[PDB]
Design a protein around this motif. Structure first.
Motif, PDB file in Angstrom:
ATOM      1  N   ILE A  88     -32.869  16.027 -46.587  1.00 57.60           N
ATOM      2  CA  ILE A  88     -32.719  16.224 -48.027  1.00 57.60           C
ATOM      3  C   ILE A  88     -33.519  17.462 -48.479  1.00 57.60           C
ATOM      4  CG2 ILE A  88     -33.347  15.256 -50.277  1.00 57.60           C
ATOM      5  CD1 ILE A  88     -32.359  12.543 -49.181  1.00 57.60           C
ATOM      6  N   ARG A  89     -34.688  17.682 -47.868  1.00 58.50           N
ATOM      7  CA  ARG A  89     -35.496  18.867 -48.157  1.00 58.50           C
ATOM      8  C   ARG A  89     -34.795  20.058 -47.550  1.00 58.50           C
ATOM      9  NH1 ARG A  89     -40.081  17.114 -46.170  1.00 58.50           N
ATOM     10  NH2 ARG A  89     -40.153  17.181 -43.866  1.00 58.50           N
ATOM     11  N   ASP A  90     -34.264  19.866 -46.361  1.00 61.87           N
ATOM     12  CA  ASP A  90     -33.588  20.956 -45.676  1.00 61.87           C
ATOM     13  C   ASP A  90     -32.499  21.561 -46.572  1.00 61.87           C
ATOM     14  OD1 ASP A  90     -31.724  22.290 -43.512  1.00 61.87           O
ATOM     15  OD2 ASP A  90     -33.468  21.587 -42.366  1.00 61.87           O
ATOM     16  N   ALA A  91     -31.833  20.712 -47.357  1.00 59.92           N
ATOM     17  CA  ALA A  91     -30.857  21.183 -48.325  1.00 59.92           C
ATOM     18  C   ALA A  91     -31.548  21.902 -49.484  1.00 59.92           C
ATOM     19  CB  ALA A  91     -30.011  20.021 -48.840  1.00 59.92           C
ATOM     20  N   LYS A  92     -32.504  21.228 -50.109  1.00 60.50           N
ATOM     21  CA  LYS A  92     -33.214  21.807 -51.252  1.00 60.50           C
ATOM     22  C   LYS A  92     -33.997  23.074 -50.884  1.00 60.50           C
ATOM     23  CE  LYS A  92     -33.609  17.438 -53.756  1.00 60.50           C
ATOM     24  NZ  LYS A  92     -34.482  16.250 -53.921  1.00 60.50           N
ATOM     25  N   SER A  93     -34.392  23.210 -49.620  1.00 61.51           N
ATOM     26  CA  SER A  93     -35.039  24.435 -49.178  1.00 61.51           C
ATOM     27  C   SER A  93     -34.069  25.620 -49.257  1.00 61.51           C
ATOM     28  CB  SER A  93     -35.573  24.283 -47.751  1.00 61.51           C
ATOM     29  OG  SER A  93     -34.521  24.273 -46.803  1.00 61.51           O
ATOM     30  N   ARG A  94     -32.828  25.404 -48.827  1.00 59.45           N
ATOM     31  CA  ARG A  94     -31.790  26.431 -48.882  1.00 59.45           C
ATOM     32  C   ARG A  94     -31.084  26.478 -50.246  1.00 59.45           C
ATOM     33  NH1 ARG A  94     -28.084  24.431 -45.797  1.00 59.45           N
ATOM     34  NH2 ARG A  94     -29.153  22.520 -45.033  1.00 59.45           N
ATOM     35  N   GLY A  95     -31.530  25.642 -51.190  1.00 61.13           N
ATOM     36  CA  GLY A  95     -30.997  25.620 -52.539  1.00 61.13           C
ATOM     37  C   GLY A  95     -30.085  24.443 -52.836  1.00 61.13           C
ATOM     38  N   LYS A  96     -29.543  23.822 -51.799  1.00 66.04           N
ATOM     39  CA  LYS A  96     -28.381  22.972 -51.960  1.00 66.04           C
ATOM     40  C   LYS A  96     -28.707  21.597 -52.529  1.00 66.04           C
ATOM     41  CE  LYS A  96     -25.492  25.761 -50.016  1.00 66.04           C
ATOM     42  NZ  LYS A  96     -25.917  26.206 -48.655  1.00 66.04           N
ATOM     43  N   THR A  97     -27.673  20.958 -53.073  1.00 66.52           N
ATOM     44  CA  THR A  97     -27.749  19.569 -53.504  1.00 66.52           C
ATOM     45  C   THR A  97     -27.193  18.650 -52.416  1.00 66.52           C
ATOM     46  OG1 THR A  97     -25.596  19.744 -54.610  1.00 66.52           O
ATOM     47  CG2 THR A  97     -27.571  20.135 -55.949  1.00 66.52           C
ATOM     48  N   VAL A  98     -27.524  17.371 -52.525  1.00 69.84           N
ATOM     49  CA  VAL A  98     -26.961  16.347 -51.661  1.00 69.84           C
ATOM     50  C   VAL A  98     -26.233  15.328 -52.531  1.00 69.84           C
ATOM     51  CG1 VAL A  98     -28.740  16.690 -49.907  1.00 69.84           C
ATOM     52  CG2 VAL A  98     -29.018  14.886 -51.636  1.00 69.84           C
ATOM     53  N   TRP A  99     -25.376  14.549 -51.885  1.00 65.41           N
ATOM     54  CA  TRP A  99     -24.552  13.584 -52.584  1.00 65.41           C
ATOM     55  C   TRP A  99     -25.416  12.435 -53.160  1.00 65.41           C
ATOM     56  CZ3 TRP A  99     -22.429   8.895 -53.386  1.00 65.41           C
ATOM     57  CH2 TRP A  99     -21.125   8.854 -53.922  1.00 65.41           C
ATOM     58  N   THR A 100     -26.257  11.849 -52.323  1.00 66.53           N
ATOM     59  CA  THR A 100     -27.205  10.829 -52.746  1.00 66.53           C
ATOM     60  C   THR A 100     -28.534  11.067 -52.059  1.00 66.53           C
ATOM     61  OG1 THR A 100     -27.633   8.436 -52.957  1.00 66.53           O
ATOM     62  CG2 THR A 100     -26.596   9.179 -50.937  1.00 66.53           C
ATOM     63  N   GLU A 101     -29.590  10.528 -52.654  1.00 68.58           N
ATOM     64  CA  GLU A 101     -30.919  10.573 -52.054  1.00 68.58           C
ATOM     65  C   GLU A 101     -31.389   9.211 -51.551  1.00 68.58           C
ATOM     66  OE1 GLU A 101     -33.794  13.155 -53.871  1.00 68.58           O
ATOM     67  OE2 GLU A 101     -32.367  13.907 -55.358  1.00 68.58           O
ATOM     68  N   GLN A 102     -30.592   8.166 -51.744  1.00 68.05           N
ATOM     69  CA  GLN A 102     -30.884   6.852 -51.189  1.00 68.05           C
ATOM     70  C   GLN A 102     -30.318   6.811 -49.765  1.00 68.05           C
ATOM     71  OE1 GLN A 102     -32.256   6.862 -54.363  1.00 68.05           O
ATOM     72  NE2 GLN A 102     -31.838   4.681 -54.654  1.00 68.05           N
ATOM     73  N   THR A 103     -31.183   6.601 -48.780  1.00 71.23           N
ATOM     74  CA  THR A 103     -30.754   6.616 -47.393  1.00 71.23           C
ATOM     75  C   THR A 103     -29.825   5.449 -47.053  1.00 71.23           C
ATOM     76  OG1 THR A 103     -32.737   7.817 -46.705  1.00 71.23           O
ATOM     77  CG2 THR A 103     -31.512   6.721 -44.990  1.00 71.23           C
ATOM     78  N   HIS A 104     -30.059   4.289 -47.657  1.00 69.61           N
ATOM     79  CA  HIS A 104     -29.198   3.132 -47.411  1.00 69.61           C
ATOM     80  C   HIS A 104     -27.766   3.387 -47.902  1.00 69.61           C
ATOM     81  CE1 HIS A 104     -27.545  -0.919 -47.334  1.00 69.61           C
ATOM     82  NE2 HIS A 104     -28.588  -1.312 -46.635  1.00 69.61           N
ATOM     83  N   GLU A 105     -27.631   4.042 -49.049  1.00 69.79           N
ATOM     84  CA  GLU A 105     -26.312   4.357 -49.583  1.00 69.79           C
ATOM     85  C   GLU A 105     -25.643   5.463 -48.770  1.00 69.79           C
ATOM     86  OE1 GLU A 105     -26.293   6.073 -53.583  1.00 69.79           O
ATOM     87  OE2 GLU A 105     -24.223   5.289 -53.830  1.00 69.79           O
ATOM     88  N   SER A 106     -26.431   6.384 -48.216  1.00 68.90           N
ATOM     89  CA  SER A 106     -25.876   7.446 -47.390  1.00 68.90           C
ATOM     90  C   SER A 106     -25.095   6.902 -46.188  1.00 68.90           C
ATOM     91  CB  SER A 106     -26.978   8.395 -46.894  1.00 68.90           C
ATOM     92  OG  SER A 106     -27.770   7.774 -45.892  1.00 68.90           O
ATOM     93  N   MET A 107     -25.424   5.691 -45.750  1.00 67.05           N
ATOM     94  CA  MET A 107     -24.656   5.030 -44.709  1.00 67.05           C
ATOM     95  C   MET A 107     -23.177   4.902 -45.098  1.00 67.05           C
ATOM     96  SD  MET A 107     -26.980   1.941 -43.191  1.00 67.05           S
ATOM     97  CE  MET A 107     -25.400   1.164 -42.801  1.00 67.05           C
ATOM     98  N   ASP A 108     -22.917   4.287 -46.244  1.00 70.11           N
ATOM     99  CA  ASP A 108     -21.545   4.113 -46.718  1.00 70.11           C
ATOM    100  C   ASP A 108     -20.870   5.457 -46.961  1.00 70.11           C
ATOM    101  OD1 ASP A 108     -23.400   1.961 -47.381  1.00 70.11           O
ATOM    102  OD2 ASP A 108     -21.641   0.889 -48.174  1.00 70.11           O
TER     103      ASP A 108
END
Ligand SMILES: Oc1nc(O)nc(O)n1
Ligand SMILES: Oc1nc(O)nc(O)n1
Ligand SMILES: Oc1nc(O)nc(O)n1
Ligand SMILES: Oc1nc(O)nc(O)n1
Ligand SMILES: [Cl-]
Ligand SMILES: [Cl-]
Ligand SMILES: [Cl-]
Ligand SMILES: [Cl-]
Ligand SMILES: [Cl-]
Ligand SMILES: [Cl-]
Ligand SMILES: [Cl-]
Ligand SMILES: [Cl-]
Ligand SMILES: [Cl-]
Ligand SMILES: [Cl-]
Ligand SMILES: [Cl-]
Ligand SMILES: [Cl-]
Ligand code: NA
Ligand code: NA
Ligand code: NA
Ligand code: NA
Lengths: 367, 367, 367, 367
Positions: C171-191
């Motif tokens: 999630i930092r790896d994205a924010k380091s390069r500027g980017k957003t992610v779909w969700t920040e909850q790891t449990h939800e990222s499974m689905d």
């Protein structure tokens, strides 16, 4: 006009117990019709399927209706906020707020407790978590703040709220009109609803500039220092608690911030701010029955650390971190107050700094 | 003969991480072959199906085998106790105990840390929770106590143990030979195994007279003030930690009791007993890096109350009170030490008074 | 060129047990170096903090390395997918796929089992759940489909995958390069990860037109009828299982769809499609040991109903619906096969219709 | 004298919903004062802290009081059994039993549904799980059996009960008078209370000889084939459901046994026994709306296996096997009936064979 406030914290002996409220009314401590707000902890799971909140709500409103002249309709408009989940030692309880008749008040220039209430305009499912919720909440907070007779935001110490969740029906209600929603998971909508509400409080009190949609749940450096938001009406319910000079009464509120789940010094700072003189290194035995209650928020930080140490809260699929950190901070807080009856609430997006939360204290300064 | 002890608490960065132990060996802080015991917290659920304990056990024994001359068989005999469950802020970690070579020890008459280890005679499923377990444990505790060079039981401050559970196979093993078992629920056998072991420690150290079978899990006024028992070999593993004069070293252990889950003064008493001079009302900032770790037990009392306040821990079918009280006391304890890396263990039958538990502290008194 | 396949389902006797694989190799059923894929169920919680997957993975790769000529590096490239969570009667097991040497194959024009494997290009945190994941997965599925010697997508019956989660570091790896992610909850990222992968499979196999970002987790009418996606490399692992003519072997795969959690007729349709002749109303006793395993997905529908009846799965904060529906469909499925060793996997966004999922069956048609 | 019975299964639309009962009364299907029993499933956790049972109980008794001439005191004596926990697809519902007025009954010699009710003598905490509970229950079952007009125990198909738990107060109540209790864990007392009650039913119906205290929870070969016991008055509530000739009515009950969690043939045997003619291999579509409901028990076997396959239910500290097996058998059962509204209850000691349980079916044989 602001009235003097009587504040009483009572235990719940069972899920449906309102006997202690009934006793306060019977003994003449307060009048049923003068109860303007109740803020309590119930022994449910604290999540979506927590039915201890409605059980307590019915029991308490039945007392208010039975022992007052207010109709069930008027009683139904009294803001009662039940924060479920009493993990660990946290003891189910209710803090009752009531106005004091003029012939029992001693007017004073000292800051004393005052309560303001308001309701926002209708919250649409599509508003939840977006700037629409923020603007509607901010306006209602300004309403309640004025209703408390508070002009300086620094005199607001505690804003307890109630906001709706996203349900299967409201999610359709959006898609029927075309709209999108922030999330479709109802459990996650809890954290979102409290967060968007907290941003509204922070805007209204001038703690932050108006944020954007992409800040919500993401810009955790933006927060209110007095917001305590719970879920989950189709409207934000607002309870503003602060101090006013020239009203009288015996109670006073103050606040600080818990910088992390172990920040007991933050809780002591709140108690000091409320007006209790305490030693440099206080201990619970210094309170001498003068602390009515504390009200605070907690959360697991997104970085997964507390004071440089990794914890596994965010990866725990067995026991949600909501319950883990609530039990933890419940102990930290009760260790300060010496009373397991503490208002400890979880889900603190935009409520204090990340990993922490606001903490308010109400103390009895009267004879 | 007792040897001087080096003690180091290191974090686990992941479930299988033993890199910090590897670093201690590489930097010459301690020798792999001189590690005599490890006591740690792992991030599993802390119950029956907690596989983080074996993951850490394999990772740590692989380091000890790889960097020493000991065979995997000799390494396998090193007592390593992993207490699963790090609910809340508790940080996974391992406390490493190692002997110090004579050319690095400064002999002193001051009480300094000493460790004794023993194994009891075979524990039969039918023994678990009965006087058979108590007598076999009591004899092994006397063994380890002598192995530590301790003659006065008052010099024993901390007895960390490991005892088996009742499994589907061992339960048959009893019924095959005719015998009954105390319980057939494996999750409950955890509390039973620790309780019966605790009674053995209390007998060996002369804290109680020999109890009867009907006392186990029932006479909670009978307890050891230094026992920390975990489950779950077909034998009680014993680690006695105390002080001896004339051995040298820089660490010292002390203990007290946590009278209930909020008794921070009990934790401070343990730290004071260990030899650290502290103010009258200490705070975590007074420790100046001299507290290595604390080791304590907690539990929900059978009366369902803490300081006169009801809690709902014992009725919670959603999140077992094991996890609730562990998270709670984790916060209470970490608030004292300022370090989330604390050894907090749940299931405390006959380990301290009901609702509480023993608490030991190891401090660094060296230059 | 596609090779003939030997398929064997073996139980796990414990979390770290690979003895049944070792026995298959010892008895000459299959050669260690010819194992090309393993698909199994492990007894962990099935969520984020499930360490039974890595325990089984290590145990199985150790067998493959010890009994073959492949290096640990080459063994590490064998796709092994462990779906944690065996709620209810589901029995931990592993289905082993191996190529057959030419001197043991009887070439036939009948459709027989063939397996294709591929790896996609690097999956960025910001790709997860978006069209980037869909396009990269779709390309890898086309790779594996060709690797299986399958030209007609109708001959693909089962695509088992493995994709990463969103973690605190990525999630930092994205924010380091500027980017957003779909969700920040790891449990939800499974689905989410399984859903985006499923859309890629559906595109590659021509089951849907290329969707948009707003379709993911929202347009549940878009789905693959053969996708079975699990999480959670920084790359989608792909295992394509289908049939090819002219390869030989004794096993054949077929599939259908479970329209809802109770659709046993869908499971029977899969078994029939695989080549087993069965009565009109089959029963488990008709299988005569010819069903190797079934592989299917399940989920709680977003409307909260099954066959017109409300259930409370989506509101349950105590036991996540992942575990509830897995146990439910585990029973429904094992009732069909008569064998609790069934591959039942939860989290089925874009994998079969809403509330249901694909179901594949492998049968033994040989003498 | 036994009266003809009207039976109606209605859904609960929410935790506090009794509107479907209200509608049945309004439309003249049944009279409020003629409701003699209600047996339902509620969406709580199914454990100790399940408050959905009391919420439904209040909602249903309020309807009965409001629409009848019975006082709240007389309504309070109507046996209403709420089995909490609807894991998976199980849909909250209530089966309503009512007597039919004579001018609506067609007397027939065919076996038709009859209901008998009784209350046992006071159950002491020290009785729970011992021969005292067994003898008191056995006597009450003989009472209810005679109240149903049933003389042959083979005509009893379903005995649904309600018995108390061991609480902190009742446990003292025993120790105050000197006595011991079987267990002090309230969650375990659930399984014990149902087990001891089941043994009483089995004795009363002549299914077993009188057992001893050491048989309870241990001799699982001793069981009743019609007992369905729930917890948790200070008295066993008994509802006997069977058939009588010469009473009339349109419903009939039958039963069989589920030999294990996957035994769908056992459920079909119950439906056949109830009087519905079905094909050799029936399917849910053969029922044509003639199955009112099924009522059954399930459990995880103590050997940890189902059809030779290991499962990990008994070691799961995350999700109790109560919830796992309930969801599993919920699916197995709903797959047979085609209706998620099924009465599936967990905790089945001495209720059917180990790993299984009794299963009763009520069918509508009328025009
Ligand atoms: O009911 C409830 N409890 C808590 O602690 N937090 C929220 O948002 N809701
Ligand atoms: O693994 C474990 N953790 C704790 O806290 N207590 C026991 O008995 N076992
Ligand atoms: O480990 C795992 N199990 C299941 O059932 N589903 C996912 O996505 N992961
Ligand atoms: O409330 C309840 N549900 C079930 O399934 N079993 C018992 O004993 N009680
Ligand atoms: Cl007035
Ligand atoms: Cl002032
Ligand atoms: Cl001072
Ligand atoms: Cl030496
Ligand atoms: Cl000294
Ligand atoms: Cl001082
Ligand atoms: Cl070859
Ligand atoms: Cl064909
Ligand atoms: Cl046929
Ligand atoms: Cl009549
Ligand atoms: Cl007949
Ligand atoms: Cl037929
Ligand atoms: Na915060
Ligand atoms: Na204790
Ligand atoms: Na699906
Ligand atoms: Na049974």
């Amino acid at each position: 006009m602001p009235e003097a406030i009587e504040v009483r914290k009572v235990p719940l002996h069972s899920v449906s117990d309102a006997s202690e409220l009934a006793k306060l009314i019977d003994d003449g401590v307060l009048e049923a019709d003068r109860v303007i707000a109740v803020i309590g902890k119930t022994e449910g799971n604290g999540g979506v399927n927590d039915y201890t909140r409605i059980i307590a709500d019915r029991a308490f409103r039945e007392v208010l209706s039975a022992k007052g002249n207010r109709s069930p309709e008027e009683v139904a408009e009294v803001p009662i906020v039940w924060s479920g989940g009493t993990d660990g030692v946290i003891s189910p309880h209710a803090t009752i707020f009531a106005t004091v008749p003029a012939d029992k008040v001693t007017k004073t220039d000292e800051p004393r407790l005052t309560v303001g209430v308001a309701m926002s305009e209708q919250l649409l499912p599509e508003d939840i978590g977006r700037t629409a919720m923020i603007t509607k909440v901010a306006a209602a907070v300004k309403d309640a703040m004025a209703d408390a007779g508070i002009t300086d935001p620094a005199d607001v110490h505690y804003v307890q709220t109630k906001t709706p969740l996203l349900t299967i029906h409201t999610i359709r209600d959006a898609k029927s009109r075309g709209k999108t929603v922030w999330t479709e998971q109802t459990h996650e909508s809890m954290d979102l609803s409290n967060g968007g509400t907290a941003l509204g409080i922070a805007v209204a009190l001038g703690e932050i500039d108006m944020p954007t949609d992409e800040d919500v749940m993401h810009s955790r450096e933006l927060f209110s220092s007095v917001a305590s938001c719970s879920s989950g009406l189709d409207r934000a319910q607002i309870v503003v608690v602060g101090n006013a000079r020239g009203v009288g009464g015996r109670y006073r509120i103050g606040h600080s911030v818990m910088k992390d789940p172990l920040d007991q010094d933050g809780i002591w700072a709140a108690i000091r701010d409320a007006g209790l003189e305490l030693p440099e290194r206080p201990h619970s035995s210094d309170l001498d029955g003068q602390l009515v209650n504390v009200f605070l928020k907690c959360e697991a930080s997104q970085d997964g650390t507390v004071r440089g140490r990794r914890n596994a809260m965010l990866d725990d699929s067995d026991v949600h971190w909501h319950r883990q950190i609530k039990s933890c901070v419940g102990g930290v807080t009760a260790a300060v107050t010496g009373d397991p009856a503490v208002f400890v609430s979880v889900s603190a997006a935009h409520q204090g700094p990340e990993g922490g939360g606001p903490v308010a204290a109400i103390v009895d300064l009267g004879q």
